[PDB]
Structures are given as C-alpha cells and as structure tokens.
CSV table of C-alpha atoms in Angstrom, one decimal:
chain,number,residue,atom,x,y,z
A,1,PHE,CA,-21.6,-4.2,-0.9
A,2,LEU,CA,-21.8,-0.3,-0.5
A,3,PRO,CA,-19.1,0.6,1.6
A,4,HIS,CA,-19.4,3.1,4.7
A,5,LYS,CA,-16.2,4.8,3.9
A,6,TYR,CA,-17.5,6.7,0.7
A,7,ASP,CA,-21.0,7.3,2.7
A,8,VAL,CA,-19.6,11.0,2.9
B,1,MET,CA,-7.9,16.6,9.8
B,2,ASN,CA,-5.4,14.6,7.9
B,3,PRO,CA,-2.0,13.7,9.1
B,4,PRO,CA,1.3,14.4,7.1
B,5,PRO,CA,1.9,11.4,4.8
B,6,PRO,CA,4.3,8.8,5.5
B,7,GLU,CA,8.0,9.7,4.8
B,8,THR,CA,9.2,9.2,1.3
B,9,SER,CA,12.6,10.9,1.7
B,10,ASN,CA,15.4,10.8,4.5
B,11,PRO,CA,18.7,11.3,3.2
B,12,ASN,CA,20.4,10.0,6.4
B,13,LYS,CA,18.5,6.6,6.2
B,14,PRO,CA,20.3,3.6,5.1
B,15,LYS,CA,18.8,2.5,1.6
B,16,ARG,CA,19.8,0.3,-1.1
B,17,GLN,CA,18.7,-0.7,-4.8
B,18,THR,CA,18.4,-5.0,-4.4
B,19,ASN,CA,17.3,-7.0,-7.1
B,20,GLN,CA,14.6,-7.9,-5.1
B,21,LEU,CA,13.3,-4.5,-4.9
B,22,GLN,CA,13.6,-3.8,-8.2
B,23,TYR,CA,11.1,-6.7,-8.6
B,24,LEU,CA,8.9,-5.3,-5.9
B,25,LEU,CA,8.4,-2.1,-8.4
B,26,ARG,CA,8.6,-3.4,-12.0
B,27,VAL,CA,6.4,-6.5,-11.1
B,28,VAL,CA,4.7,-6.2,-7.7
B,29,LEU,CA,3.7,-2.5,-7.6
B,30,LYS,CA,2.9,-2.4,-11.3
B,31,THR,CA,0.4,-5.2,-11.3
B,32,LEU,CA,-1.1,-3.8,-8.6
B,33,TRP,CA,-1.1,-0.2,-9.6
B,34,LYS,CA,-2.9,-0.8,-13.2
B,35,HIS,CA,-5.6,-3.0,-11.5
B,36,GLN,CA,-9.4,-1.7,-11.8
B,37,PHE,CA,-9.4,-1.9,-8.1
B,38,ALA,CA,-6.3,0.0,-7.3
B,39,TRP,CA,-7.8,3.3,-6.9
B,40,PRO,CA,-8.8,3.5,-3.3
B,41,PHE,CA,-5.1,2.6,-2.7
B,42,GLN,CA,-3.2,4.8,-4.7
B,43,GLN,CA,-2.8,7.6,-2.4
B,44,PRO,CA,-3.1,8.2,1.3
B,45,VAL,CA,-7.1,8.1,2.6
B,46,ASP,CA,-8.1,11.7,2.6
B,47,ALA,CA,-10.3,11.6,5.6
B,48,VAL,CA,-10.9,15.2,5.3
B,49,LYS,CA,-12.7,14.9,2.0
B,50,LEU,CA,-14.5,11.6,3.0
B,51,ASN,CA,-15.7,12.8,6.4
B,52,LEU,CA,-13.9,10.2,8.0
B,53,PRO,CA,-12.9,11.8,11.6
B,54,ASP,CA,-12.1,8.4,13.3
B,55,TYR,CA,-9.8,7.0,10.4
B,56,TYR,CA,-6.6,8.2,11.7
B,57,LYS,CA,-7.5,7.5,15.3
B,58,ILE,CA,-8.3,3.6,14.5
B,59,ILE,CA,-5.4,3.5,11.9
B,60,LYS,CA,-2.3,4.6,13.5
B,61,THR,CA,0.2,3.2,10.8
B,62,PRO,CA,-1.3,4.4,7.5
B,63,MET,CA,-0.1,3.2,4.3
B,64,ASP,CA,-0.9,3.1,0.5
B,65,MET,CA,0.6,2.4,-3.0
B,66,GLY,CA,1.3,6.1,-3.9
B,67,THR,CA,3.8,6.1,-0.8
B,68,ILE,CA,4.9,2.7,-1.5
B,69,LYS,CA,5.5,3.7,-5.5
B,70,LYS,CA,7.3,6.6,-4.3
B,71,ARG,CA,9.6,4.6,-2.0
B,72,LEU,CA,10.5,2.3,-4.3
B,73,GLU,CA,11.2,5.1,-7.0
B,74,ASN,CA,13.6,6.9,-4.6
B,75,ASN,CA,15.2,3.4,-3.5
B,76,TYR,CA,14.2,4.3,0.1
B,77,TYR,CA,13.8,1.0,1.4
B,78,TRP,CA,16.9,-1.1,2.8
B,79,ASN,CA,15.2,-4.5,1.9
B,80,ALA,CA,12.4,-6.3,0.4
B,81,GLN,CA,11.0,-7.3,3.7
B,82,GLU,CA,10.4,-3.3,4.7
B,83,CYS,CA,8.3,-2.9,1.4
B,84,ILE,CA,6.5,-6.3,1.7
B,85,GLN,CA,5.6,-4.9,5.0
B,86,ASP,CA,4.0,-1.8,3.8
B,87,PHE,CA,1.9,-3.6,1.5
B,88,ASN,CA,0.7,-5.9,4.0
B,89,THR,CA,0.4,-2.8,6.4
B,90,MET,CA,-2.1,-1.2,3.7
B,91,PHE,CA,-3.9,-4.5,3.2
B,92,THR,CA,-4.6,-4.9,7.0
B,93,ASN,CA,-5.5,-1.1,7.6
B,94,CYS,CA,-8.2,-1.8,5.1
B,95,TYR,CA,-9.7,-4.7,6.8
B,96,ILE,CA,-9.4,-3.3,10.3
B,97,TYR,CA,-11.6,0.0,9.2
B,98,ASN,CA,-14.1,-1.4,6.5
B,99,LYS,CA,-16.4,-4.0,6.8
B,100,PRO,CA,-16.2,-7.7,5.6
B,101,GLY,CA,-17.4,-8.0,2.4
B,102,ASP,CA,-17.9,-4.3,1.7
B,103,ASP,CA,-16.7,-3.0,-1.5
B,104,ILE,CA,-13.5,-1.7,-0.6
B,105,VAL,CA,-12.8,-4.9,1.4
B,106,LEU,CA,-13.8,-6.8,-2.0
B,107,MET,CA,-11.2,-4.2,-3.7
B,108,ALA,CA,-8.5,-5.1,-1.4
B,109,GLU,CA,-8.8,-8.9,-1.5
B,110,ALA,CA,-8.3,-8.6,-5.3
B,111,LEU,CA,-5.2,-6.8,-4.7
B,112,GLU,CA,-4.0,-8.9,-2.1
B,113,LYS,CA,-4.5,-12.0,-4.4
B,114,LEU,CA,-2.4,-10.8,-7.0
B,115,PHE,CA,0.2,-9.5,-4.6
B,116,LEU,CA,0.6,-13.0,-3.0
B,117,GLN,CA,0.8,-14.5,-6.5
B,118,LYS,CA,3.8,-11.8,-7.8
B,119,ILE,CA,5.6,-12.4,-4.4
B,120,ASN,CA,5.8,-15.9,-5.0
B,121,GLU,CA,8.7,-15.3,-7.7
B,122,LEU,CA,10.5,-12.7,-5.8
B,123,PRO,CA,14.0,-13.4,-7.0
B,124,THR,CA,16.7,-14.8,-4.5
B,125,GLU,CA,18.9,-11.6,-3.4
B,126,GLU,CA,22.0,-11.2,-5.9
C-alpha cells in the first residue's frame, strides 16, 4: 500500500 | 541533510577477492539489482529529496545496494559474511523505517526472498 516514505 | 555515504574505498583496509565474494557479485547482487523492485535500494536514501528528516536519526547504519555493488567491484570486503551483513542491514533498515505491508516493505520482502534463495548456493570457500 501507498508508503509514507514517498509522501514528500 | 544527508550524511556521507558508507565507505567504499580505504587503501589500508585488509580486503580479498574470494570465490564466495565473486558469487555474491555475479549471482546475488546481479539478481537483485535487475529486479523490478530494486530501484528504492540502488542508492543511499536521499532524505533531503524525500523530505525525511527523521531517516538518518532512526537509521544509524545505512546500507544500500549501490554501496554493496561498489564494495564488491572494488573487492573492499574481507569475507562473504561482511557482505551478507550489508544485505541484511539494508533489509532490516527498511523494515525498521517503513510500515509493515507498505509498498517499500513489499519490495524489500521480494528482494530478500531472492537473496535467501541465492545465498543457499554460496560455494564453499576455495
């Protein structure tokens, strides 16, 4: 699922 | 800011080319590097570009396949265990920082499965 790491 | 990357050159460090280390480059790293899920792991995490000011506060032994690749190409390691430790550090960092089941973790899990399958045939040291 959509990862926080790339939620810039 | 980003820290300096892990060391890949050190003239005075004891180092070897062994058949096991050759296998780690030719089979293990090559297999993971070409995978569709390699890309997050092919270079140090850029905490500046990704706006992750906590990454290098949490992760104090960063590791990535770009670093591993350079170390193997330079014959920087002393032994296979040191290189295997770098792979395991890379995976563990991912699982520490990212959320279980998130896309980055899923990617690491796929690479780690392949890692484990390839290191099964690590040759006896010659």
